[PDB]
Amino acid sequence: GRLIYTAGGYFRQSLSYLEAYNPSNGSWLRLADLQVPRSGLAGCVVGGLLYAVGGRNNSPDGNTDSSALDCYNPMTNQWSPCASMSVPRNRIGVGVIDGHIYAVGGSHGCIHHSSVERYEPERDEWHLVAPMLTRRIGVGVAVLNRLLYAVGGFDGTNRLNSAECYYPERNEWRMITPMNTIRSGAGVCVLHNCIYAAGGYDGQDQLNSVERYDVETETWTFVAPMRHHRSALGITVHQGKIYVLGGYDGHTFLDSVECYDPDSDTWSEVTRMTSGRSGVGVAVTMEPC
Numbered sequence: 001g002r003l004i005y006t007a008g009g010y011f012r013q014s015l016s017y018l019e020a021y022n023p024s025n026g027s028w029l030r031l032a033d034l035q036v037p038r039s040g041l042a043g044c045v046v047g048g049l050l051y052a053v054g055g056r057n058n059s060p061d062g063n064t065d066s067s068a069l070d071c072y073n074p075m076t077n078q079w080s081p082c083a084s085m086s087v088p089r090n091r092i093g094v095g096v097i098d099g100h101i102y103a104v105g106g107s108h109g110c111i112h113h114s115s116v117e118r119y120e121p122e123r124d125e126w127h128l129v130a131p132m133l134t135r136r137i138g139v140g141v142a143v144l145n146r147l148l149y150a151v152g153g154f155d156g157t158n159r160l161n162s163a164e165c166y167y168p169e170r171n172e173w174r175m176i177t178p179m180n181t182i183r184s185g186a187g188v189c190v191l192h193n194c195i196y197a198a199g200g201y202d203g204q205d206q207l208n209s210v211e212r213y214d215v216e217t218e219t220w221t222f223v224a225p226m227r228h229h230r231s232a233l234g235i236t237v238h239q240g241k242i243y244v245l246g247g248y249d250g251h252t253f254l255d256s257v258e259c260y261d262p263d264s265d266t267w268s269e270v271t272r273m274t275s276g277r278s279g280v281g282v283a284v285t286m287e288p289c
């Protein structure tokens with residue numbers, strides 16, 4: 001059985017929580033805390049290991065953007081440090097291609113990154129690759145057909161409807177069709193042949209709208225909106241369904257988890273996180289121990 005892991009996030013300050021939700025039975029487990037609290041981080045999995053990438057420790061004692069990569073082994077319930085990235089990356093996006101982790105965009109103070117770098121677990125090494133054509137923080141990232149997509153975000157001046165694609169064998173970024181909606185701090189993931197962008201912030205309002213990019217047709221289409229408006233949501237895919245976790249609706253730090261069924265085109269309430277939070281990192285792997 002596979003669990004949805006939620007790492008870090010933010011309520012009043014950055015959080016070190018790691019909890020796992022089991023869609024088979026509705027249960028949550030609290031597991032080993034992150035060594036350093038962090039929000040605006042991303043989660044991913046490689047070789048059954050869970051990686052926590054970037055973010056920022058918002059704390060009474062000071063605010064520190066994170067260049068960290070940390071690894072969680074469900075067998076041991078332990079976090080281990082890995083090599084750090086070239087630069088701190090708050091409000092990061094991440095994607096995995098052929099066992100390598102791409103860290104995309106994010107901020108370091110008022111620096112809004114276009115830079116992109118790639119982690120090789122077998123060497124414990126990061127290396128920079130071609131930078132994006134756009135500076136993007138709060139960027140959505142997904143992998144489809146071993147191509148890496150950077151969707152939306154904030155460029156230091158505007159929230160973006162734009163999106164682009166990285167072609168590894170050419171070390172080259174190219175723009176794709178822009179989204180119909182400006183989305184910064186959205187949830188972005190892949191399901192079947194489409195990149196989904198759920199929620200985010202458009203410069204005025206947190207969004208409940210959801211749209212998907214079909215690579216074969218190069219168009220974005222709206223699907224059913226989520227029940228909750230949300231920015232800074234976590235998102236993942238588990239057994240052919242999209243799950244969205246937490247975020248911010250202009251009023252509340254949400255504990256809502258919703259899931260999307262693409263065949264009925266419907267969203268439904270699935271569970272509540274143990275406490276409301278925004279800016280989490282999420283991924284799916286095997287259950288611990």
Ligand SMILES: CN(C)C(=O)c1cccc(-c2cccc(-n3ncc(C(=O)O)c3[C@@H]3C[C@H]3c3cn(C)nn3)c2)c1
Pocket residue numbers: 010039040091137138139153154159184185200201206231232247248250278279
């Ligand atoms: C309200 N609060 C501060 C938190 O809940 C929060 C706390 C810690 C980390 C994040 C976070 C995580 C990922 C992306 C972004 N992000 N990246 C870019 C922009 C933008 O604003 O363009 C944003 C923020 C989410 C959107 C936002 C802004 N507003 C007013 N609502 N949502 C933030 C949000």
Ligand SMILES: [Cl-]
Pocket residue numbers: 039040056058090
């Ligand atoms: Cl922040």
